[PDB]
RNA sequence: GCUUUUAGUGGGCCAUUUUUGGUAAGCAGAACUGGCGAUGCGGGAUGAACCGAACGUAGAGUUAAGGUGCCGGAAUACACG
RNA sequence: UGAUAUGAUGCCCUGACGAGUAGGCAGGCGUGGAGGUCAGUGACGAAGCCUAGACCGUAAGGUCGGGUCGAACGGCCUCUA
């Protein structure tokens, strides 16, 4: 036998290809695992990673939040890179030209970028534009602002909101959460 | 006429028997596996029948093969045996069970005429 | 895709280590030591014998 | 405990920097091998020095053969060994060919009438008798005698085969 | 029927499976617990420098 | 493109030229070691012939091998068992001497057998026996360009330069030594000498540090 | 019943030192404690009033605070699978500056200097620390030490 | 390195060492570790816990603990009492 | 991923590992009914049943021959209990 130092058999843990049965997906994959293995480029496996990535670890990215990476002193001619969707910020009134490349884009959020003149590319396209994925700017969306969040890490002292369904007065505010009723948290 | 193999070791050639198949006729052949707390054969007690185990895996090489060496391939009719036409000596056809027997002699026809191999020919023959 | 064996085997024992040709050649394996004829002292000698 | 060989062994305490060259002592060790001489030299020295083994270095390890192996010898030899109920000096003779030959047999004996393992005896000295009558335990004085003579009476062959046509004779 | 009252058998073995994780540093420990009229002060202390070198790159 | 005979013919004369550095390589090492015990011997002798006694060099290399199985080991020798890799039964390892070290061997003596290996089982060790870890997968060494493309930074292009690095314990030692995976080696083909085992050495058992005696036990289990 | 109180247990280890009993000198007082210092933690038994618990007994710890008769002091302490951190105010009779940093800081100070030395004259350092190495060969003497020959001695009794 | 979520469990018992009650117990109760429970395999005739050794299907070699008069594989081996 | 040949979850090279109750997960076997397909099988014999006859699979199981039988039934992708 051997004393095992480390659990046998063990599953790496990390996805292979995405869990999505979508072909156009699928595609993307396979664009980009050939561009992993050939390219020597770094920005090339970052991407190949992130198309497995599931929903939620794929957080949309705001077309404000776009514009704000380009005030970047020395950024504002890269071409941001969206892997996952971008999304229409209402509350800037003025965004830049650039070019913009992301698996979607909603109605109203590539209609603001191509309204200033920008560009609108699919992964492929910016594959054939920029096989190292030369002069390019990753964004990635906010993980941790999802609601589920607010409710992990749940416990005494902790600060984490509470699993509940009504909410108000007389929804779990009185003995335990103040110092009038039993004690406080 | 068989693509040539290496010789097929069948690795265990006995049945696994479901433990007491041979005690009860309440019980079958068809094996199923010991949950019992106390149980000899779950605890591997020296002396009992064993039980299936992927080690007892045949090589990936000959896995499927026949004693000829040609995987079988069940066909109704013509146009299934003569998916065979550009692989001879790979598969054969095995003629299915309910096949009428005057069908049976056009497709035994047929496979003569494409050098296809049959393992039942002799099957509703008329004699 | 089979490991052969240096000890056991001359050609790959001559692969590893060209120095072995030589050795085996020159003999060295079976080497002959000077001759001195240098004495140990009478205080080691008895001390060895001694009680 | 094995086929013994006897060997000199010598040490001493670490040089300190205010006692460089310490005293250097000797013992003559019957053992095996010299890991086992080595050790018994720590065991019997920390049992008279201030030392052991971790504070002291063996200077020397040599092995002493028999000056006479050929020439039959009168061995006395003194002992100390540990009863189950009290530990004990004594005193035999060994008549034997080697020094070394001699402590092989002693510790068969005490094994044997003794029930002495190896653990519970210290070989305290082993000595040549020079002159006859100083020798003392009679199980030896009766070898000593002059035109010294005896036969041995019932001798048993040993056959090399299970069965045999003849029946079998003692003579010699 | 009385029945065990305690041990620690075993507790260790299960401690160490995943565990006895090493206290975890960080560089700018929090403030907690600390005398308030120095982190008043402090606070104050820290907003001056930060105006001062704003008013290096002025 | 050329490259037929063009670019062999620059590899086979580039081949040729590592040989050669190997060759008057391992023609020194073997001048070193002769002279080496040659001079030790001498050492000896004059001191005898000045009555003054020569003590040795206290060993700075040792090889243990794990004499004893997988279960019902006590959690403390089990440790140190796993970080000097012996992780299964008769396999071993090289091990070098310190007080860091040699306290270790204190607490394993029980589940173990150890001592000096001479030049020659170490050679043999490694010719027959001797692995790489080269992105982990226990590679045979088998041919020395194995051991420049892993051991290379160290000097090292042999499989002589390795052994060599091992019994002169050299700089780069602990390199050289992590680099070999564990030697796995059979059961003794004289059989252990003892009647039990689970003694030590000098009680008339086999485990402990049994010094110069292991090269004998280890060439009959390799 | 069982009894758990706070200084439950604690009867030798607030227990004064022979012949050192009353008041505590002075030196005790004039000493400074600074953010970040490496403290000991010892109780004093002659001070009521900030006194560490005696779990935190022969344990050392970081200064997180200094206030006007004490140091808060951080000391991670293992409670389950995990180590917590703990923050203690104690009073400055029951706090002692470690020497548990003294070898390295001495050692970092003759560093530097013998690595500039050795740039200014060139190159060959080794500032590393090792372990003892075994020992080299030598020759010892019979000069003067001729060995003494020991056996084992014979049972006795003396009583 | 980090996060979430969820099963079963919440009668335990044994061995060396430390150890309390009891004349004591194959009794009752703690300490550290290793085990049985959940585990077959070789040894101790037999046996939950001892010794050895932890299991994919197989070939050749070598061993452990334990054995080698006959049952029974293996010296009615050598040697001193 | 390079077409002009057949599986890209594929194909090829290499290393290590394999005990298991309660329990978790995974990949598969089998059944009644549903959408699609193979213009599937069948009164020149469907289904079923019998058979120390044959063949494939580690296995759940699958396939054939022969006997008996008499009107219906199956493969594959999916759906459902
Ligand atoms: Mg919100
Ligand atoms: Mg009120
Ligand atoms: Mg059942
Ligand atoms: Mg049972
Ligand atoms: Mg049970
Ligand atoms: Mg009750
Ligand atoms: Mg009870
Ligand atoms: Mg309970
Ligand atoms: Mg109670
Ligand atoms: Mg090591
Ligand atoms: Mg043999
Ligand atoms: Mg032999
Ligand atoms: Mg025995
Ligand atoms: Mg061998
Ligand atoms: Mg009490
Ligand atoms: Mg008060
Ligand atoms: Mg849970
Ligand atoms: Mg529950
Ligand atoms: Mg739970
Ligand atoms: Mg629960
Ligand atoms: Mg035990
Ligand atoms: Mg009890
Ligand atoms: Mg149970
Ligand atoms: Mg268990
Ligand atoms: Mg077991
Ligand atoms: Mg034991
Ligand atoms: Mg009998
Ligand atoms: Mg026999
Ligand atoms: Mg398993
Ligand atoms: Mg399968
Ligand atoms: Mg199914
Ligand atoms: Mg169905
Ligand atoms: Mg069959
Ligand atoms: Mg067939
Ligand atoms: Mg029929
Ligand atoms: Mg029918
Ligand atoms: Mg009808
Ligand atoms: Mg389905």
Same mark, same amino acid.
């Given at each position: 036998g051997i004393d095992h130092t480390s659990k046998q058999h063990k599953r790496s843990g990390h996805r292979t290809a995405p869990k999505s049965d979508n072909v156009y997906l699928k595609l993307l994959v396979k664009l980009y695992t050939f561009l992993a293995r050939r390219t020597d480029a770094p920005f090339n496996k970052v991407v190949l990673k992130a198309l497995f990535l599931s929903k939620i670890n794929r957080p949309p990215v705001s077309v404000s939040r776009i514009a704000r990476a380009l005030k970047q002193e020395g950024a504002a001619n890269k071409t941001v890179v969206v892997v996952g969707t971008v999304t229409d910020d209402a509350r800037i009134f003025e965004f830049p030209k650039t070019t913009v490349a992301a698996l979607r884009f909603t109605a109203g959020a590539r209609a603001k970028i191509v309204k200033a003149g920008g560009e609108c590319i699919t992964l492929d396209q910016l594959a054939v534009r920029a096989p190292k994925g030369q002069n390019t700017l990753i964004l990635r969306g906010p993980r941790n602002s999802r609601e589920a969040v607010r409710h992990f890490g749940m416990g005494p002292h902790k600060g984490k909101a509470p699993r509940i369904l009504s909410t108000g007065r007389?929804?779990?505010?009185?003995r335990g959460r103040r110092r009038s009723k039993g004690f406080k948290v | 006429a068989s693509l040539p193999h290496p010789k097929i070791v069948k690795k265990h050639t006995k049945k696994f028997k479901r433990h007491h198949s041979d005690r009860y006729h309440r019980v079958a052949e068809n094996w199923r596996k010991q949950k019992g707390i106390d149980s000899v054969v779950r605890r591997r007690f020296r002396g009992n029948i064993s039980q299936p185990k992927i080690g007892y895996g045949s090589n990936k090489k000959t896995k499927f093969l026949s004693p000829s060496g040609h995987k079988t391939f069940l066909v109704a009719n013509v146009k299934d045996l003569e998916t065979l036409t550009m692989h001879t000596k790979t598969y054969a056809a095995e003629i299915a069970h309910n096949i009428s027997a005057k069908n049976r002699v056009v497709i035994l026809a047929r496979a003569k005429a494409l050098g296809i191999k049959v393992t039942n020919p002799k099957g509703r023959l008329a004699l | 895709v089979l490991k052969k064996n240096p000890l056991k085997n001359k050609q790959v024992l001559l692969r590893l280590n060209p120095y072995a040709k030589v050795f085996a050649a020159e003999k060295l394996g079976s080497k002959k030591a000077e001759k001195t004829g240098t004495k140990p002292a009478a205080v080691f000698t008895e001390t060895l014998k001694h009680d | 405990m094995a086929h013994f060989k006897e060997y000199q062994v010598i040490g001493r305490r670490l040089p300190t920097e205010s006692v460089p060259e310490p005293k250097l002592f000797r013992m003559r060790i019957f053992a095996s091998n010299e890991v086992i001489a080595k050790s018994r030299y720590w065991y019997f020295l920390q049992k008279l020095h201030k030392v052991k083994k971790a504070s002291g270095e063996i200077v020397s390890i040599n092995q002493i053969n028999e000056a006479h192996p050929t020439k039959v010898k009168n061995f006395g030899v003194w002992v100390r060994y540990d009863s189950r109920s009290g530990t004990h000096n004594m005193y035999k003779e060994i008549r034997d060919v080697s020094r070394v030959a001699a402590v092989e047999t002693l510790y068969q004996d005490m094994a044997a009438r003794h029930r002495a393992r190896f653990r519970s005896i210290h070989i305290l000295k082993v000595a040549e008798i020079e002159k006859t009558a100083d020798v003392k335990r009679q199980y030896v004085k009766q070898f000593l005698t002059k035109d010294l003579k005896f036969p041995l009476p019932h001798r048993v062959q040993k056959s090399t085969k299970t069965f045999s046509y003849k029946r079998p004779s003692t003579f010699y | 029927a009385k029945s065990k009252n305690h041990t620690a058998h075993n507790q260790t073995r299960k401690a160490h499976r995943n565990g006895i994780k090493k206290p975890k540093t960080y560089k700018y420990p929090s403030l907690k617990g600390v005398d308030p009229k120095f982190r008043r002060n402090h606070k104050h202390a820290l907003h001056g420098t930060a105006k001062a070198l704003a008013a290096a790159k002025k | 493109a050329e490259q037929v005979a063009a670019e062999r013919a620059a590899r086979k004369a580039a081949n040729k030229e590592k040989r050669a550095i190997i060759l008057e390589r391992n023609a020194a090492y073997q001048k070193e070691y002769e002279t080496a015990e040659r001079n030790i011997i001498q050492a000896k002798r004059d001191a005898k012939a000045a009555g003054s006694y020569y003590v040795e060099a206290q060993h700075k290399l040792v090889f243990v091998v794990? @004499? *004893?199985? @997988?279960? *019902? @080991?006590?959690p403390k020798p089990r440790k140190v068992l796993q970080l000097l890799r012996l992780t299964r039964i008769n396999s071993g390892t090289f091990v070098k001497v310190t007080k860091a070290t040699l306290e270790l061997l204190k607490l394993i003596e029980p589940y173990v057998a150890y001592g000096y290996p001479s030049y020659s089982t170490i050679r043999q060790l490694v010719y027959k026996r001797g692995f790489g870890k080269i992105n982990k997968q226990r590679v045979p060494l088998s041919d020395n360009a194995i051991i420049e493309a892993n051991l290379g930074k160290y000097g090292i292009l042999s499989i002589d330069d390795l052994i060599h690095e091992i019994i002169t314990v050299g700089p780069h030692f602990k390199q050289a030594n992590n680099f070999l995976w564990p030697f796995k080696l059979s059961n003794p083909s004289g059989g252990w000498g003892v009647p039990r085992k689970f003694k030590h050495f000098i009680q008339g058992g086999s485990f402990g540090n049994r010094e110069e005696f292991i090269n004998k036990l280890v060439k009959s289990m390799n | 019943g069982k009894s758990h109180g706070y200084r439950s247990r604690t009867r030798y280890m607030f227990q004064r030192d022979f012949r050192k009993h009353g008041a505590v000198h002075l030196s005790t007082y004039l000493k400074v404690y600074k953010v970040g210092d490496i403290v000991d933690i010892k109780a004093n038994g002659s001070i009521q009033k900030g006194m560490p618990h005696k779990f935190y007994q022969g344990k050392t710890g970081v200064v997180y605070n200094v206030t006007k008769s004490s140091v808060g002091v951080i000391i991670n302490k293992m409670v389950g699978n995990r180590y917590l951190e703990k923050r203690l105010n104690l009073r400055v009779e029951h706090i002692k500056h470690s020497k548990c940093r003294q070898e390295f800081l001495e050692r970092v100070k003759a560093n530097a200097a013998k690595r500039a030395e050795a740039k200014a004259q060139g190159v060959a350092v080794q500032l590393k620390r090792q372990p003892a190495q075994p020992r080299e060969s030598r020759i010892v003497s019979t000069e003067g030490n001729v060995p003494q020959t020991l056996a084992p001695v014979p049972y006795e009794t003396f009583i």
């Amino acid at each position: 036998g051997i004393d095992h130092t480390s659990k046998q058999h063990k599953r790496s843990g990390h996805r292979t290809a995405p869990k999505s049965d979508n072909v156009y997906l699928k595609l993307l994959v396979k664009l980009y695992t050939f561009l992993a293995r050939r390219t020597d480029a770094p920005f090339n496996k970052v991407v190949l990673k992130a198309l497995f990535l599931s929903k939620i670890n794929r957080p949309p990215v705001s077309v404000s939040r776009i514009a704000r990476a380009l005030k970047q002193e020395g950024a504002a001619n890269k071409t941001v890179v969206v892997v996952g969707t971008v999304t229409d910020d209402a509350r800037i009134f003025e965004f830049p030209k650039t070019t913009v490349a992301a698996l979607r884009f909603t109605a109203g959020a590539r209609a603001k970028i191509v309204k200033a003149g920008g560009e609108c590319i699919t992964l492929d396209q910016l594959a054939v534009r920029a096989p190292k994925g030369q002069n390019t700017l990753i964004l990635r969306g906010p993980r941790n602002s999802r609601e589920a969040v607010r409710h992990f890490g749940m416990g005494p002292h902790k600060g984490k909101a509470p699993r509940i369904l009504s909410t108000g007065r007389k929804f779990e505010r009185a003995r335990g959460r103040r110092r009038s009723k039993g004690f406080k948290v | 006429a068989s693509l040539p193999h290496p010789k097929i070791v069948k690795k265990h050639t006995k049945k696994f028997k479901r433990h007491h198949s041979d005690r009860y006729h309440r019980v079958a052949e068809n094996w199923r596996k010991q949950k019992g707390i106390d149980s000899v054969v779950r605890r591997r007690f020296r002396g009992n029948i064993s039980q299936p185990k992927i080690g007892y895996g045949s090589n990936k090489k000959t896995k499927f093969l026949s004693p000829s060496g040609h995987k079988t391939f069940l066909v109704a009719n013509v146009k299934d045996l003569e998916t065979l036409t550009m692989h001879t000596k790979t598969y054969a056809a095995e003629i299915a069970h309910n096949i009428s027997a005057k069908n049976r002699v056009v497709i035994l026809a047929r496979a003569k005429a494409l050098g296809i191999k049959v393992t039942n020919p002799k099957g509703r023959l008329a004699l | 895709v089979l490991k052969k064996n240096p000890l056991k085997n001359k050609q790959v024992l001559l692969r590893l280590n060209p120095y072995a040709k030589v050795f085996a050649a020159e003999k060295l394996g079976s080497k002959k030591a000077e001759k001195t004829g240098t004495k140990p002292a009478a205080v080691f000698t008895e001390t060895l014998k001694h009680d | 405990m094995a086929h013994f060989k006897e060997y000199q062994v010598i040490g001493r305490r670490l040089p300190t920097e205010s006692v460089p060259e310490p005293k250097l002592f000797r013992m003559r060790i019957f053992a095996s091998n010299e890991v086992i001489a080595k050790s018994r030299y720590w065991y019997f020295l920390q049992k008279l020095h201030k030392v052991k083994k971790a504070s002291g270095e063996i200077v020397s390890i040599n092995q002493i053969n028999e000056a006479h192996p050929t020439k039959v010898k009168n061995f006395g030899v003194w002992v100390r060994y540990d009863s189950r109920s009290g530990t004990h000096n004594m005193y035999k003779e060994i008549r034997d060919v080697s020094r070394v030959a001699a402590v092989e047999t002693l510790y068969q004996d005490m094994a044997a009438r003794h029930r002495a393992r190896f653990r519970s005896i210290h070989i305290l000295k082993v000595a040549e008798i020079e002159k006859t009558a100083d020798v003392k335990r009679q199980y030896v004085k009766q070898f000593l005698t002059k035109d010294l003579k005896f036969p041995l009476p019932h001798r048993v062959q040993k056959s090399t085969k299970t069965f045999s046509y003849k029946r079998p004779s003692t003579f010699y | 029927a009385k029945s065990k009252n305690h041990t620690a058998h075993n507790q260790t073995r299960k401690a160490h499976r995943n565990g006895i994780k090493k206290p975890k540093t960080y560089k700018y420990p929090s403030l907690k617990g600390v005398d308030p009229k120095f982190r008043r002060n402090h606070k104050h202390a820290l907003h001056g420098t930060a105006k001062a070198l704003a008013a290096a790159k002025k | 493109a050329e490259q037929v005979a063009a670019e062999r013919a620059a590899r086979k004369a580039a081949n040729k030229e590592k040989r050669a550095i190997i060759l008057e390589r391992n023609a020194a090492y073997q001048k070193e070691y002769e002279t080496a015990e040659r001079n030790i011997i001498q050492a000896k002798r004059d001191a005898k012939a000045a009555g003054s006694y020569y003590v040795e060099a206290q060993h700075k290399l040792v090889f243990v091998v794990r @004499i *004893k199985g @997988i279960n *019902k @080991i006590p959690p403390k020798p089990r440790k140190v068992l796993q970080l000097l890799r012996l992780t299964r039964i008769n396999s071993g390892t090289f091990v070098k001497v310190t007080k860091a070290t040699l306290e270790l061997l204190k607490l394993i003596e029980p589940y173990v057998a150890y001592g000096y290996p001479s030049y020659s089982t170490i050679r043999q060790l490694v010719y027959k026996r001797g692995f790489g870890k080269i992105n982990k997968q226990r590679v045979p060494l088998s041919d020395n360009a194995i051991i420049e493309a892993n051991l290379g930074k160290y000097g090292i292009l042999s499989i002589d330069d390795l052994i060599h690095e091992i019994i002169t314990v050299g700089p780069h030692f602990k390199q050289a030594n992590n680099f070999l995976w564990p030697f796995k080696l059979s059961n003794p083909s004289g059989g252990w000498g003892v009647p039990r085992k689970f003694k030590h050495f000098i009680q008339g058992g086999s485990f402990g540090n049994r010094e110069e005696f292991i090269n004998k036990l280890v060439k009959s289990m390799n | 019943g069982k009894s758990h109180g706070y200084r439950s247990r604690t009867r030798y280890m607030f227990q004064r030192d022979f012949r050192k009993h009353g008041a505590v000198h002075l030196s005790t007082y004039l000493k400074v404690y600074k953010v970040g210092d490496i403290v000991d933690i010892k109780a004093n038994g002659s001070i009521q009033k900030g006194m560490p618990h005696k779990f935190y007994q022969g344990k050392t710890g970081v200064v997180y605070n200094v206030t006007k008769s004490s140091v808060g002091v951080i000391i991670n302490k293992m409670v389950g699978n995990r180590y917590l951190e703990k923050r203690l105010n104690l009073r400055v009779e029951h706090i002692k500056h470690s020497k548990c940093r003294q070898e390295f800081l001495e050692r970092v100070k003759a560093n530097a200097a013998k690595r500039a030395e050795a740039k200014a004259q060139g190159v060959a350092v080794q500032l590393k620390r090792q372990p003892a190495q075994p020992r080299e060969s030598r020759i010892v003497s019979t000069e003067g030490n001729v060995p003494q020959t020991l056996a084992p001695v014979p049972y006795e009794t003396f009583i």
